[PDB]
Amino acid sequence: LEEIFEEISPIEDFSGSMSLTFRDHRFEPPKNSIDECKDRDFTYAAPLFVTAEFTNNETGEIKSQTVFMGDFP
Amino acid sequence: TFKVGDTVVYPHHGAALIEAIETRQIKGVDKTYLVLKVAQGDLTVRVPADNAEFVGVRDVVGQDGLDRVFEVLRAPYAEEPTNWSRRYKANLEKLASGDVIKVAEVVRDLWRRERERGLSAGEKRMLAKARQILVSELALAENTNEDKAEALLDEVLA
Amino acid sequence: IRNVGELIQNQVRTGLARMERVVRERMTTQDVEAITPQTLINIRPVVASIKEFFGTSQLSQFMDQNNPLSGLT
Amino acid sequence: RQAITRAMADQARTIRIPVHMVEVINKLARVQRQMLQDLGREPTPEELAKELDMTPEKVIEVQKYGREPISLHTPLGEDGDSEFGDLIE
């Protein structure tokens, strides 16, 4: 997952102004146990976070934030 | 102009606190970056001091701010165009301007419009966002508690 | 052989490419100083791609539990 | 934009939906997506009902009306001849 997050390079617009970078990915323990998922018709998954920072060159402004990318099975 | 431990108002995010001064080098130039954060979105903002005035940062206004925003909040004879599209295009521009007087006028007129008939559910999102950023701006200006900040405005907007 | 890791990685890559197209379309019609990492990216393509992989696919197969030998096979 | 979204309301769906119901359902979809990306979880229909100022029964009726038909000719799997339309009486 770190390979596929680093594959998405910080992209640039037509003016080459913005950039966003997914530095680190991390996992939390699943909210439902395996027997809970089996019994109650759920999908055994854990939340997947990534630390995305938004950097603008013209303003010199960096916005580092953690965004929830989905329940990875 | 900017020190450590002080509170600074950043546009579209409200009041924020500065942690430390960063000396990251870009192309061999030691820019004087400063890092700040809010408690709303859990994000860190790094701004150099040279272009801080250009990006639109602004300090804490003292006793000269609450009285002027109250008197423009109590100012009568405010009118809007009959077509809702022109007012809709004007209000987000006034929000993006970042002026405290402008956002106070926008929230006062919008609240009056919601009181008289009731506008919609879509505009509730932006009224809520504007009230949140305005109460965050006034909360750290008077150094009052956030519940006290939202309570004190309840008896003055009528 | 594309193992389970490579297959799920390819599906996540397709989802992230769709997300990159969506965020490009978003930033082409958005003003600066109003962009937040929580806003311009959408995790819907990634979760949609993952869920479309784990169901209705020729690779993610309903496991047969006739006996332990069938499970291992 | 007005004509394109009007024709999308009146022509894209096989079971035609009026334009006011189309804007209601897509507004509900976009606010549900916003709550999903904010809270990080699927929002409960009751919270959606309060934030949309509508009754929960109206909310579940809107979610019911926001569907898409599935074709009768979708194959089940390895066999091409056994169709989805031949499994229903």
UniProtKB/Swiss-Prot annotation, chain A:
Stated family: Belongs to the RNA polymerase beta chain family.
Subunit and partners: The RNAP catalytic core consists of 2 alpha, 1 beta, 1 beta' and 1 omega subunit. When a sigma factor is associated with the core the holoenzyme is formed, which can initiate transcription. The RNAP complex including the principal sigma factor HrdB also interacts with RNA-binding protein RbpA.
Function as written in the Swiss-Prot or TrEMBL entry: DNA-dependent RNA polymerase catalyzes the transcription of DNA into RNA using the four ribonucleoside triphosphates as substrates.
The protein's name in its UniProt record: DNA-directed RNA polymerase subunit beta
Gene: rpoB
Residues of the whole record sequence present: 74 to 146 of 1161
From Swiss-Prot, chain D:
Superkingdom in the source lineage: Bacteria
Region described as Sigma-70 factor domain-3: spans on this chain: 23-89
Binding partners and assembly: Homotrimer (Potential). interacts transiently with the RNA polymerase core complex. Interacts with RNA polymerase-binding protein RbpA via its sigma-2 region (residues 211-347) in a free form.
Function as written in the Swiss-Prot or TrEMBL entry: Sigma factors are initiation factors that promote the attachment of RNA polymerase to specific initiation sites and are then released. This sigma factor is the primary sigma factor during exponential growth. Its activity is stimulated by RbpA.
Family: Belongs to the sigma-70 factor family.
Name by which UniProt lists this protein: RNA polymerase principal sigma factor HrdB
Organism the protein comes from: Streptomyces coelicolor (strain ATCC BAA-471 / A3(2) / M145)
First and last residues shown, out of full length: 335 to 423 of 511
